Design a protein around this nucleic acid. Structure first.
Ligand code: DCP
Ligand code: BAP
Ligand code: MG
Ligand code: MG
Ligand code: MG
Ligand code: MG
Length: 433
DNA sequence: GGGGTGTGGTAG
DNA sequence: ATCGCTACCACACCCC
């Protein structure tokens, strides 16, 4: 029934179930597809061009598709009336996606099922649907195909399985730009709904990447929003949390909330901040990025994907990360796992016709004062992260060289097998042919 | 007195 | 039970 981490089937089984594995693998495939489809198309934007960004994503993607494709066992439930989540388990299992009914009760993606169940009023039951991974891929394919078929974008950039940044180069100062672009948003939404047999998308439309992303958030669910730099207002900025900004996650949020005393929205932040205080709080680069974002402007790093997508989407490293289900008794089993992981990576490296000249082993070790078993079944729990890299010299795809050095890096780090809670094996530098 | 490594962080 | 991946950016430290 259960495949343990010392079983040869473990990696196959874990990756077959892991939604985060699928997200990353799908993204890697989409980047490759982009490169292959545009090998003769030399399209890119310059700092002289005027353009409009359409940032397009599916509403509650896994929930929508899992519902549409649900087994006969779930015939009864109603996507507009019932709170619906996609997950594996029944207690401390991540909600991959939840529908907007579930969200009306305060349920959010990434919440455990056990937290979610508490938020429902008595009587109302949470509906848990299984993942339909294959069908997520087919719906994505129909999405990307529709975007291309419309023949309206100069550039279509894959962000994720359910999300694309689509660029139209346009003349500066078009008359009736808001109406003309609204019509495009309406057409796009209709075509994708038809082309995916009933999945909805939202669209954020602007003249910068950062504003198009924010506009998309404002549009959800099942809508569009057009907010150009010239349309910015306090009311717009009042609608966004600080971590709605790209590059602001949980850690950066914590720092900003401390420095600026818990602003409730981007408008509150806009009113309190200085560039110097930002940089002191979150560092020079991120500080500048945020400052620019609060003016509706993109930083230069973010713009690289417009100016040279082929360079940006090129793969520069290859790794696996397993930080769930890792429970080893001894070093013999750790070594066998490292060997299997190295072969998995070599099969991928060989499939993309590359070699590697540098590797890294990263591990998660149980914190001294953390419980031996965490609350989440097979979770890593609270850990310290340690890593060591090695240059191999000449670029290679030889198992003997790579795997031997990986096992050696494990020994240098000195983690007792019973304290190990996660492992990452990385090929950091790749060379073609 | 500039750069390589380990560490921390972000996005779906 | 439950499936906490993975590419890529940033930067503090520490070298002699
Ligand atoms: N930590 C994450 C992030 C995303 N996903 C998966 C499930 C989501 O359905 C899909 C797309 O991610 P989004 O962040 O776009 O979330 P949704 O599409 O579910 O909702 P929204 O309507 O907010 O876009 O990726 C996941 O499993 N775990
Ligand atoms: C697991 C992990 C870590 C950090 C965080 C921080 C904030 C979180 C909020 C909500 C859910 C959640 C789940 C897993 C998390 C979270 C959060 C890291 O410290 C750890 O290494 C893992 O990524
Ligand atoms: Mg989204
Ligand atoms: Mg989505
Ligand atoms: Mg998305
Ligand atoms: Mg954010």
């Amino acid at each position: 029934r259960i495949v343990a981490c010392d079983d040869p089937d473990f990696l196959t089984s874990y990756f077959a179930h892991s939604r985060l594995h699928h997200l990353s693998a799908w993204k890697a495939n989409l980047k490759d597809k982009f490169l292959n489809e545009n090998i003769h198309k030399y399209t890119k934007i310059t700092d002289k061009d005027t353009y409009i960004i359409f940032h397009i994503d599916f509403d509650c993607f896994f929930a929508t598709v899992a519902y549409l494709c649900r087994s006969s066992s779930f015939s009864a439930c109603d996507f507009k009336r019932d709170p619906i989540v996609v997950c594996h388990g029944t207690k401390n299992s991540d909600i991959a996606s939840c529908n907007y009914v579930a969200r009306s009760y305060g349920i959010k993606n990434g919440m455990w099922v056990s937290q979610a169940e508490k938020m429902l009023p008595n009587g109302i039951k949470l509906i848990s649907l299984p993942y339909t991974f294959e069908q997520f891929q087919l719906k994505s394919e129909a999405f990307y195909s529709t975007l291309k078929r419309l023949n309206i974008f100069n550039l279509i950039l894959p962000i994720s399985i359910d999300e694309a940044v689509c660029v139209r180069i346009i003349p500066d100062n078009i008359h009736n730009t808001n109406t003309l672009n609204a019509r495009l948003c309406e057409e796009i939404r209709q075509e994708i709904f038809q082309g995916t047999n009933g999945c909805t998308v939202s669209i954020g439309c602007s003249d910068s990447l950062v504003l198009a992303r924010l506009a998309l958030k404002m549009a959800k669910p099942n809508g569009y929003n057009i907010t150009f730099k010239s349309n910015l207002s306090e009311e717009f900025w009042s609608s966004f949390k600080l971590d709605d900004l790209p590059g602001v996650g949980h850690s950066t949020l914590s720092r900003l909330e401390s420095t600026f005393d818990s602003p409730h929205s981007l408008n509150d932040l806009r009113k309190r901040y200085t560039l110097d205080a930002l940089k002191a709080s979150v560092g020079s680069k991120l500080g500048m990025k945020i400052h620019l974002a609060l003016q509706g402007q993109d930083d230069e790093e973010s713009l690289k994907i417009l100016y040279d997508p082929k360079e940006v989407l090129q793969r520069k490293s290859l790794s696996i990360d397993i930080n769930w289900g890792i429970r080893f008794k001894n070093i013999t089993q750790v070594d066998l796992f490292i060997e299997r992981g190295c072969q998995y990576l070599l099969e991928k490296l060989n499939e993309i016709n590359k070699t590697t000249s540098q590797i890294t082993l990263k591990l998660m070790r149980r914190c001294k004062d953390a419980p031996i078993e965490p609350p989440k079944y097979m979770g890593m729990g609270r850990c310290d992260s340690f890593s060591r890299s090695s240059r191999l010299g000449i670029p290679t795809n030889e198992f003997g060289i790579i795997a031997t050095e990986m096992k050696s890096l494990y020994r240098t780090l000195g983690c007792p097998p019973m304290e190990l809670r996660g492992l990452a094996l990385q090929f950091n530098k790749l060379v073609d042919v």
